[PDB]
């Protein structure tokens, strides 16, 4: 196993952990604030997916500070992971193209 495929795999498992912990921590911080809709785990898990994937949507979002900090973590972990996979596809393509040129 290379590096760009170990990291791509590791980032996926790390992202799932961010999605799950983000769902749990979102409900923890959103409950107590009036009007908050991010207060059940199943839909928070759906929100964390919307959030990590940056679809966002708008049916769910945090209204508390610590809920919005949890958001920031979920977004960055999502953008970085899906970007680390792209960077891994480039190394795979740049690599196999060197083999197509002999070198």
């Amino acid at each position, epitope marked *: 196993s290379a590096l760009h495929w170990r990291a791509a795999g590791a980032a996926t498992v790390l992202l799932v952990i961010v999605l799950l912990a983000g769902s*749990y921590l979102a409900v*923890l911080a*959103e409950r*107590g*604030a*009036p009007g*908050a809709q991010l207060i*059940t*785990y199943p839909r928070a898990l759906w929100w964390s997916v919307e959030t990590a994937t940056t679809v966002g949507x708008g049916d769910l979002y945090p209204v508390t500070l610590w809920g919005r900090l949890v958001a920031v973590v979920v977004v960055v972990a999502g953008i970085t992971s899906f970007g680390l996979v792209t960077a891994a596809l480039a190394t795979w393509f740049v690599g196999r193209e060197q083999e197509r040129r002999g070198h």
Partner: antibody
Amino acid sequence: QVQLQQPGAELVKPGASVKLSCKASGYTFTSDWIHWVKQRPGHGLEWIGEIIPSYGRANYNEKIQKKATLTADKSSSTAFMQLSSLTSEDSAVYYCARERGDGYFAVWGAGTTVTVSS
Amino acid sequence: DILLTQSPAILSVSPGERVSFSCRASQSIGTDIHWYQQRTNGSPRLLIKYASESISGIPSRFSGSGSGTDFTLSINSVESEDIANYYCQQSNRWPFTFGSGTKLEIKR
């Protein structure tokens, strides 16, 4: 088996305090929220607050004069509601309910009749 | 906060006849409504969750309907055991709020 177990009754002198219990059994997850509901005789159900025992954070009904303080001993699977400075207005039945973090109260306790009298 | 209005508060119906309770939320709450039954001196018991999803142990004559703001709990063929108070409860926005309650009354 009985999941949420509450005492029968408590007699509280006016202005005194009382610590109601709610021992749990059955599947206890980390997503368990324990709620407390107040029902005056003849009246409806009134949400008081919620507690997450796997962390210890408690939220309370913003619309009422806060008369409760929710705790939880994670080792004994027991949620406690500490009422204090009670009047006859606080004399009612107090249920505890278990929420699986998904909105509904899956199970309730038998409730504890709290009588504030001399 | 979301207000759960239950009108009428009392509902008369003949035995074996179909009944329907009404729960209205002050704003749209999707399907995040739940129904509870409370007989005399008994604890509330969950009848219907998420407007229409049923519970095991609750008879099949208990059904639910509605979305957004208008929700309905219906009983096909009312029985004497159905005599109780019926509350609705929303979990769309915090805090959770209850309905005022509707008393079922059989005319035998």
